[PDB]
Design an enzyme around this catalytic site. Structure first.
Site, PDB file in Angstrom:
ATOM      1  N   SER E 211      30.131  39.336  46.360  1.00 11.59           N
ATOM      2  CA  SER E 211      31.577  39.453  46.451  1.00 11.59           C
ATOM      3  C   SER E 211      32.127  38.212  47.133  1.00 11.59           C
ATOM      4  CB  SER E 211      31.985  40.710  47.221  1.00 11.59           C
ATOM      5  OG  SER E 211      33.375  40.941  47.122  1.00 11.59           O
ATOM      6  N   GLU E 277      58.356  49.987  29.520  1.00 10.96           N
ATOM      7  CA  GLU E 277      58.300  50.278  30.940  1.00 10.96           C
ATOM      8  C   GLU E 277      58.226  48.982  31.741  1.00 10.96           C
ATOM      9  OE1 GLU E 277      58.823  52.533  32.911  1.00 10.96           O
ATOM     10  OE2 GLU E 277      58.706  54.433  31.831  1.00 10.96           O
TER      11      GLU E 277
HETATM   12  C1  HEM Z   1      40.854  49.740  36.345  1.00 14.52           C
HETATM   13  C2  HEM Z   1      41.271  48.760  37.140  1.00 14.52           C
HETATM   14  C3  HEM Z   1      40.328  48.026  37.997  1.00 14.52           C
HETATM   15  C4  HEM Z   1      39.426  48.548  38.860  1.00 14.52           C
HETATM   16  C5  HEM Z   1      39.152  49.992  39.164  1.00 14.52           C
HETATM   17  C6  HEM Z   1      38.755  47.468  39.456  1.00 14.52           C
HETATM   18  C7  HEM Z   1      37.772  47.728  40.392  1.00 14.52           C
HETATM   19  C8  HEM Z   1      37.217  46.715  41.118  1.00 14.52           C
HETATM   20  C9  HEM Z   1      36.345  46.902  42.188  1.00 14.52           C
HETATM   21  C10 HEM Z   1      35.878  48.227  42.724  1.00 14.52           C
HETATM   22  C11 HEM Z   1      36.009  45.680  42.642  1.00 14.52           C
HETATM   23  C12 HEM Z   1      35.086  45.444  43.795  1.00 14.52           C
HETATM   24  C13 HEM Z   1      35.849  45.614  45.107  1.00 14.52           C
HETATM   25  C14 HEM Z   1      36.842  44.503  45.250  1.00 14.52           C
HETATM   26  O1  HEM Z   1      36.457  43.367  45.284  1.00 14.52           O
HETATM   27  O2  HEM Z   1      38.149  44.770  45.342  1.00 14.52           O
HETATM   28  C15 HEM Z   1      36.669  44.715  41.853  1.00 14.52           C
HETATM   29  C16 HEM Z   1      36.547  43.355  42.026  1.00 14.52           C
HETATM   30  C17 HEM Z   1      37.134  42.417  41.180  1.00 14.52           C
HETATM   31  N1  HEM Z   1      37.956  42.657  40.156  1.00 14.52           N
HETATM   32 FE1  HEM Z   1      38.553  44.472  39.557  1.00 14.52          FE
HETATM   33  N2  HEM Z   1      39.208  46.297  38.993  1.00 14.52           N
HETATM   34  C18 HEM Z   1      40.173  46.557  38.101  1.00 14.52           C
HETATM   35  C19 HEM Z   1      40.943  45.668  37.362  1.00 14.52           C
HETATM   36  C20 HEM Z   1      40.714  44.311  37.413  1.00 14.52           C
HETATM   37  C21 HEM Z   1      41.387  43.369  36.640  1.00 14.52           C
HETATM   38  C22 HEM Z   1      42.461  43.685  35.637  1.00 14.52           C
HETATM   39  C23 HEM Z   1      40.873  42.131  36.968  1.00 14.52           C
HETATM   40  C24 HEM Z   1      41.283  40.832  36.417  1.00 14.52           C
HETATM   41  C25 HEM Z   1      41.254  40.580  35.116  1.00 14.52           C
HETATM   42  C26 HEM Z   1      39.882  42.334  37.964  1.00 14.52           C
HETATM   43  C27 HEM Z   1      39.159  41.311  38.523  1.00 14.52           C
HETATM   44  C28 HEM Z   1      38.311  41.504  39.605  1.00 14.52           C
HETATM   45  C29 HEM Z   1      37.669  40.407  40.317  1.00 14.52           C
HETATM   46  C30 HEM Z   1      37.805  38.941  40.014  1.00 14.52           C
HETATM   47  C31 HEM Z   1      36.939  40.963  41.297  1.00 14.52           C
HETATM   48  C32 HEM Z   1      36.100  40.196  42.284  1.00 14.52           C
HETATM   49  C33 HEM Z   1      36.464  40.552  43.719  1.00 14.52           C
HETATM   50  C34 HEM Z   1      36.162  39.400  44.628  1.00 14.52           C
HETATM   51  O3  HEM Z   1      36.089  38.288  44.179  1.00 14.52           O
HETATM   52  O4  HEM Z   1      35.974  39.618  45.934  1.00 14.52           O
HETATM   53  N3  HEM Z   1      39.806  43.682  38.214  1.00 14.52           N
HETATM   54  N4  HEM Z   1      37.410  45.384  40.915  1.00 14.52           N
END
Ligand code: HEM
Ligand SMILES: CCCCCCCCCCCCCCCCCC(=O)OC[C@H](COP(=O)([O-])OCC(O)COP(=O)([O-])OC[C@@H](COC(=O)CCCCCCCCCCCCCCCCC)OC(=O)CCCCCCCCCCCCCCCCC)OC(=O)CCCCCCCCCCCCCCCCC
Ligand SMILES: CCCCCCCCCCCCCCCCCC(=O)OC[C@H](COP(=O)([O-])OCC(O)COP(=O)([O-])OC[C@@H](COC(=O)CCCCCCCCCCCCCCCCC)OC(=O)CCCCCCCCCCCCCCCCC)OC(=O)CCCCCCCCCCCCCCCCC
Ligand SMILES: CCCCCCCCCCCCCCCCCC(=O)OC[C@H](COP(=O)(O)OCCN)OC(=O)CCCCCCCCCCCCCCCCC
Ligand SMILES: CCCCCCCCCCCCCCCCCC(=O)OC[C@H](COP(=O)(O)OCCN)OC(=O)CCCCCCCCCCCCCCCCC
Ligand SMILES: CCCCCCCCCCCCCCCCCC(=O)OC[C@H](COP(=O)(O)OCCN)OC(=O)CCCCCCCCCCCCCCCCC
Ligand SMILES: CCCCCCCCCCCCCCCCCC(=O)OC[C@H](COP(=O)(O)OCCN)OC(=O)CCCCCCCCCCCCCCCCC
Ligand SMILES: CCCCCCCCCCCCCCCCCC(=O)OC[C@H](COP(=O)(O)OCCN)OC(=O)CCCCCCCCCCCCCCCCC
Ligand code: HEM
Ligand code: HEM
Ligand code: HEM
Lengths: 31, 115, 74, 60, 388, 52, 388, 116
Positions: E211, E277
């Protein structure tokens, strides 16, 4: 590279034939 | 290219980077992630253990400060060398070796794994 | 009384014997029927492709319009 | 044996040619089976189809 | 250590995978609350699924019964207004949280290597959310519902050779009638489970590559276990979100919507103001700004192409925006542009909004086109600023 | 001998390999801790590529 | 083996889990065609899910439109008759192959250690299958569907303390009406995805300990990979199942059905023969055979108690019934009794069927009450037949 | 009671059938004890000599191969088979007795089964 081009062209021909067989646009094809 | 000592904007940019990097007690080279490039990984493997260990200590200190929401004391901020780099020469050498190896028929010595 | 595996390893022989219970051997000098198996598999693949095509078309055209709206449109 | 090996060297040296052959054979076999089953249907139930009733167009 | 007799239940095979990936996953010690936003988006998805199931226990997908069935849910069902307001405003909060998630990713450049797969799966997730929310908004069958369905489905005619065929096939019968209503109900019920699968894959890829952290640096020196250190942080985030969402449910439940969706669909008259929306408004504004509707559809495809093309940039060595003043300013300008773009989409096509939208969308693509230049110059930085 | 050796080019190598290697039968002889060595079908399938 | 550079795209992290658990998972080299049924129940589930989604694009869960909507799918929709017959006969096929799965497990004692969790998750899957099939069968809203729902849900009022309260809550009113139909539709849509999750957990546990074999012996000496050796075996199984299913779709599409379901439900008239589908018949037969209907519900619970208690019996070191003549005969008697009991369910509740069903239930429970005794007595076989 | 084939015709027939089956597949009755089943069999096999355990593994592999091939042992080795010539019951009894003593007075289990 020429061999790669020939292989890519043949694979494109195969994919086009598959799409044509799936859709069956024999009626559509006027030209 | 007219960056140093002739561009007011570039001087301001250097001032800002020095401020921030010394504030967290880091160096510019420490910003190079080994996981990012896989050439930084080889360079860090080739570098001496003392230099690598100092880099890791600085990184751990910076992460600790970032967690605590505070900066280095003014004394250690003064005793900072944000741009006393240690990685550029080894990285350039690794890149040059890669360049010749790809230039004349060679397998890469390492590749990124498909995630 | 050297063991069976040791005697087999230390004495290679060209008179190799297989099981031949449910798969009979070809005589030692004979070409391999490699093409025939490939053509059998080719016929099977004919069938499989036709079935996949049928299923995709059936579902997609089920999602298509219906005789009710077609007759309603005048 | 010879015939199978000959068609093998014709159509089994590149997988793209093989895939094209598989698709073409599937299409041709499907159409042939359609035709055969339709001929069997016509032979079996003769005198029952829609365009066979003697008074098809006299309800006016 | 030979596991002769079992010490802890958490290390037993029944709870071993859960142990690793939930309790023992090492996490950078300096994470701020936006990682909490990611967890919060997950919770919003679960809330949507549960309330949607219990709502579908009372919704009739017929054209003659959908609107009155929803009014049934509001008036007759025991505590049904709570279910419906929770579903609608929860869609809104789901999109708010996902937007904050995305913009944190952009700010800290989390899309960079080795998290290209994480970013791409996120883009796929965003597409799924868009489709699900759209088909769901068609369900209540009001004026805005019917006419938005009509417009957004009929802009699929822009495809060169097969546009009309796709439009008619998706419509099922030359219009957006009962057939489209049933079709959309089934798809709206199905899609959230694919969304759950996509979210699980998203998390799996991230867990593969660790992460990021607010510094963007390598972070395997100071790492702590996820539980309890980040569970409590996420809990603070969840309670604050619950207060926000309770403000929206109980006191201002219809602010985030339009009043035209409370009129039964009448395909004869047309409401004077047809907008989607609020969370589709930036995309709608881009599409409306670029004329020649084929060009509009191409522009939406280009938006998603740019979003998918962010991770695969060349140098981009320094990651975080804390050490990138130029990129920090560029990001803030992009965020202001996105907000302005969203505001433009609710306005009519009368001037000057056409000019403002045609500038804002261009600036959006300009942001997406000037990040590699900054990366190359930054790669050039170290051999110029040396202090010796 | 040198003329015969340098009369071999890439096309000749491909033709000879296709005559001797492409989709032919291998003969494997192994001993030792070979419990992880792939079986006959694995090698026999690896003697050709499905991409080309 | 240092993975400095890529060898095989199967071993890359993107395809590594699938590689392991599908292509490279070692299985005993002597498995028969009885494991293809486990491989085939998943295919039946996928068929059910896909056909059900495409059917739900055309079904209306109201009480005045359900039957006419099903007939709309029958007649107007292009290929709709194929979809509906596929869904119905596919529920039948799903239950057939799952019964074959269960009975192979019983024959080869696959429930024995260390696969207690595999068997228990299988029992939970069986519960989910039963509930899904029932609540789905109520959907077409025929005479049999309406009255079977009435009878079975009303027979949930046998619980002493709550009873009528739970029945009223489940019905959404005072009788099986529109609310129950809508509720049943939503639940029928949801439950198959929980069934997919349960199947995945089932497979995860089995892969934790590996599959059994006809001999029932430890089999880590002679093992081969799953692909391609068992892929082709399962392919033969799938094609044979496809021929069977095609027979049951195109030539006998209603033989497994009950003709009274093609009558629109009429709450003021009761059909002379209220019986469930053929695959609830043994359970129905036990329930009816035990009098004092509270006792019948207790017996139905006891059936699942016995099924869950099977893996936790006594020593019984030998497991495969190929080396257990007495257990082999007992298993054949059990299978015959289950078939006979299934026959009894369709029969009226007159004589002598009451006695035949009362004896059959006793034999069915005696099977579970006798196997621990067999194990206890056979624990001391080697000391008696030894040739010392 | 204790019913042995000398004092019971039914036990004699049962033993005859078991002997026939095991001789067909050429594996002793003790080879059917799964180490993963009890974890006391695992310990008893850990305590036995390597020659005996290797013979057990070889017999099991032969049986599994015959099962896959859908055939039985040839009549020669079938007449040479010796089922019920045990090699494990005494050691298993010793292990179980030791476990019973340890459990009876204080003591923690020397080995335990994972969950699941
Ligand atoms: C259903 C919606 C989504 C869920 C449930 C979700 C869930 C998560 C979770 C659980 C993580 C790990 C915890 C965190 O770092 O916050 C994460 C990380 C991440 N998510 Fe999502 N995500 C969603 C939508 C998206 C979208 C739309 C993007 C971009 C296109 C995205 C890009 C990322 C990235 C880049 C990370 C890396 C975190 C970091 O760099 O520290 N996510 N997501
Ligand atoms: C995935 C993948 O890459 O597989 C290739 C991989 C090929 O083997 P490899 O060891 O990676 O490389 C062999 C050759 O060197 C390289 O293999 P190759 O060159 O023969 O081709 C492998 C792959 C490579 O693809 C590309 O290069 C692109 O290309 C293709 O598969 C050609 C497909 C052409 C279009 C067909 C329509 O496939 C397999 O090993 C078989 C996978 C079987 C999966 C079965 C799943 C279901 C079974 C369980 C059911 C329950
Ligand atoms: C009076 C005395 C009458 C004695 C009759 C004995 C007799 O019929 O034994 C046949 C046979 C017993 O012969 P066996 O070789 O001693 O035992 C078979 C092995 O256990 C297992 O050996 P296997 O793998 O050769 O046998 C498995 C059996 C598997 O047979 C079945 O699954 C059919 C089940 C029908 C109920 O398959 C076959 O027999 C060969 C054809 C397989 C085609 C693929 C079927 C897949 C499922 C198709 C979709 C079903 C929905 O009976 C059964 O297997 C039952
Ligand atoms: C539209 C979507 C519809 C639904 C699709 C299916 C949804 C499935 C939901 C459950 C998925 C659970 C995760 C499965 C994949 C996984 O666990 O991959 C692990 C792997 C981690 O990387 P690594 O540490 O290298 O692991 C391989 C060697 N240990 O992971 C990775 O490296 C990344 C894997 C990405 C996904 C591959 C498939
Ligand atoms: C050309 C921009 C020149 C530049 O980068 O100037 C440096 C400035 C740093 O900003 P800051 O750190 O707030 O300055 C205090 C300095 N001790 O950087 C900035 O003010 C950032 C400006 C970004 C504009 C992007 C458009
Ligand atoms: C332990 C297992 C788990 C526990 C649950 C129980 C599982 C049981 C597994 C096996 C299930 C077998 C199901 C048998 C269904 C029998 C259906 C039946 O009774 O069919 C009868 C029918 C005869 O014809 P018909 O004219 O309908 O009969 C006269 C009726 N008035 O047709 C025929 O006779 C044919
Ligand atoms: C109905 C039950 C009849 C038998 C009652 C006694 C009993 O339970 O004996 C157990 C034993 C079972 O033997 P079984 O497991 O089938 O095969 C040998 C591999 N363990 O069966 C025996 O040992 C039977 C020996 C005596 C003969 C029957 C009296
Ligand atoms: C009461 C039952 C007492 C059984 C006592 C032990 C019988 C052992 C025996 O050999 O039984 C004969 C036979 C199985 O033996 P076998 O003839 O070898 O079968 C395979 C080749 N025909 O057949 C059996 O073992 C059948 C046993 C059926 C038991 C039903 C109990 C209720
Ligand atoms: C499987 C889970 C879901 C089910 C069963 C479901 C079901 C429904 C039903 C029946 C309605 C109409 C009831 C009403 O008018 O209030 C509805 C409305 C809606 N749903 Fe969902 N839904 C689910 C998940 C989601 C998700 C994940 C989203 C995305 C955020 C979403 C977005 C919407 C929207 C925007 C509406 C219209 C709100 C309104 O009524 O004004 N739904 N859903
Ligand atoms: C998400 C997946 C599923 C959906 C959307 C679904 C949807 C439907 C719908 C709309 C009907 C009514 C149409 C009709 O009666 O033909 C139906 C009927 C039925 N479903 Fe499902 N179903 C699903 C999965 C299943 C599964 C897994 C089973 C079996 C366990 C099942 C068993 C049945 C049965 C028995 C009927 C009654 C068929 C009849 O008698 O007409 N369904 N389903
Ligand atoms: C949704 C229905 C089910 C599916 C998809 C399913 C799937 C599978 C699969 C894929 C396997 C591994 C392949 C095999 O061994 O045949 C398996 C094995 C097994 N299943 Fe199921 N199963 C289902 C229902 C059940 C039920 C109801 C039970 C019993 C309560 C059960 C008990 C077992 C057992 C004991 C094994 C181990 C087989 C062995 O001895 O190696 N399954 N199942």
């Amino acid at each position: 590279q020429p061999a790669d081009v020939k292989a890519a062209a043949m694979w494109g021909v195969a994919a086009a034939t598959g799409g044509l067989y799936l859709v069956q646009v024999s009626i559509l094809v006027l030209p | 290219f007219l960056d140093p000592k002739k561009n007011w904007l570039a001087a301001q940019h250097m001032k800002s980077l020095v401020k921030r990097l010394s504030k967290y007690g880091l160096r510019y080279d420490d910003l190079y992630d080994p996981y990012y490039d896989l050439d930084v990984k080889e360079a860090l493997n080739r570098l001496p253990k003392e230099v690598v260990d100092a880099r890791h200590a600085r990184l751990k200190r910076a992460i600790d400060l970032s967690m605590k929401h505070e900066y280095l004391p003014e004394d250690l901020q003064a005793m900072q060398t944000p741009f006393r780099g240690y990685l550029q020469d080894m990285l350039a050498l690794v890149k040059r070796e890669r360049a010749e190896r790809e230039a004349l028929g060679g397998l890469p010595l390492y590749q990124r794994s498909i995630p | 009384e050297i063991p069976a595996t040791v005697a087999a390893v230390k004495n290679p022989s060209s008179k190799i014997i297989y099981d031949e219970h449910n798969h009979e051997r070809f005589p030692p000098g004979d070409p391999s029927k490699r093409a025939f198996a490939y053509f059998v598999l080719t016929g099977g693949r004919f069938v499989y492709a036709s079935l996949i095509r049928l299923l995709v078309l059936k579902f997609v055209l089920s999602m298509s319009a219906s005789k009710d709206v077609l007759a309603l449109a005048s | 044996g010879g015939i199978f090996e000959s068609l093998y060297k014709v159509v089994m040296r590149r997988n793209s040619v093989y895939v094209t052959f598989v698709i073409a054979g599937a299409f041709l076999g499907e159409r042939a089976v359609d035709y055969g089953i339709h001929k069997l249907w016509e032979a079996n139930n003769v005198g029952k189809r829609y365009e066979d009733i003697p008074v098809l167009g006299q309800k006016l | 250590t030979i596991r002769n007799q079992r010490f802890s239940l958490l290390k037993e095979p029944i709870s071993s995978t859960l142990n690793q990936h939930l309790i023992d996953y090492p996490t950078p010690s300096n994470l701020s609350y936006w990682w909490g936003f990611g967890s919060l988006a997950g919770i919003c998805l679960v809330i949507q699924i549960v309330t949607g199931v219990f709502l579908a226990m009372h919704y009739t997908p017929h054209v003659d019964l959908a609107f009155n069935s929803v009014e049934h849910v509001m008036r007759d069902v025991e505590g049904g207004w709570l279910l419906r307001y929770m579903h609608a405003n929860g869609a809104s909060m789901f999109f708010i949280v996902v937007y904050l998630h995305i913009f944190r990713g952009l700010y800290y450049a989390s899309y960079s290597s080795p998290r290209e797969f994480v970013w791409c799966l996120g883009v796929v997730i965003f597409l799924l959310m868009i489709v699900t929310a759209f088909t769901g908004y068609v369900l209540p069958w009001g004026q805005m519902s019917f006419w938005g369905a009509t417009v957004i489905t009929s802009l699929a005619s822009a495809i060169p050779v097969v546009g009309d065929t796709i439009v008619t096939w998706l419509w099922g019968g030359f219009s957006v009638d009962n057939a489209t209503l049933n079709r959309f109900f089934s798809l709206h019920y199905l899609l959230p489970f694919l969304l759950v699968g996509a979210s699980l894959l998203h998390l799996a890829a991230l867990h593969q590559y660790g992460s990021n952290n607010p510094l963007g640096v390598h972070s395997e020196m100071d790492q702590i276990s996820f539980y309890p250190y980040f569970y409590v942080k996420d809990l603070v985030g969840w309670v604050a979100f619950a207060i926000f969402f309770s403000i929206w449910i109980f006191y201002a439940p219809n602010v985030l919507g339009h009043p035209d969706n409370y009129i039964p669909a009448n395909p004869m008259s047309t409401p004077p103001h047809i907008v989607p929306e609020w969370y589709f408004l930036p995309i709608y504004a881009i599409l409306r700004s670029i004329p020649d509707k084929s060009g509009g559809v191409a522009a939406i495809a280009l938006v998603f192409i740019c979003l998918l093309a962010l991770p695969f940039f060349k140098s981009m060595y320094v990651r975080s925006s804390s050490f990138r003043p130029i990129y920090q300013g560029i990001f803030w300008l992009l965020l202001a542009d996105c907000l302005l773009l969203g505001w433009i989409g609710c306005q009519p096509v009368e001037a000057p909004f056409v000019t403002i939208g045609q500038i804002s969308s261009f600036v959006f693509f300009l942001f997406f086109a000037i990040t590699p230049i900054l990366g190359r110059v930054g790669r050039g930085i170290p051999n110029s600023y040396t202090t010796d | 001998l040198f003329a015969r050796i340098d009369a071999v080019d890439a096309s000749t190598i491909k033709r000879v390999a296709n005559r001797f290697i492409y989709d032919k039968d291998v003969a494997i002889a192994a001993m030792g801790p070979i419990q992880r060595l792939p079986d006959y079908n694995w090698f026999r399938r690896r003697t050709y590529w499905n991409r080309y």
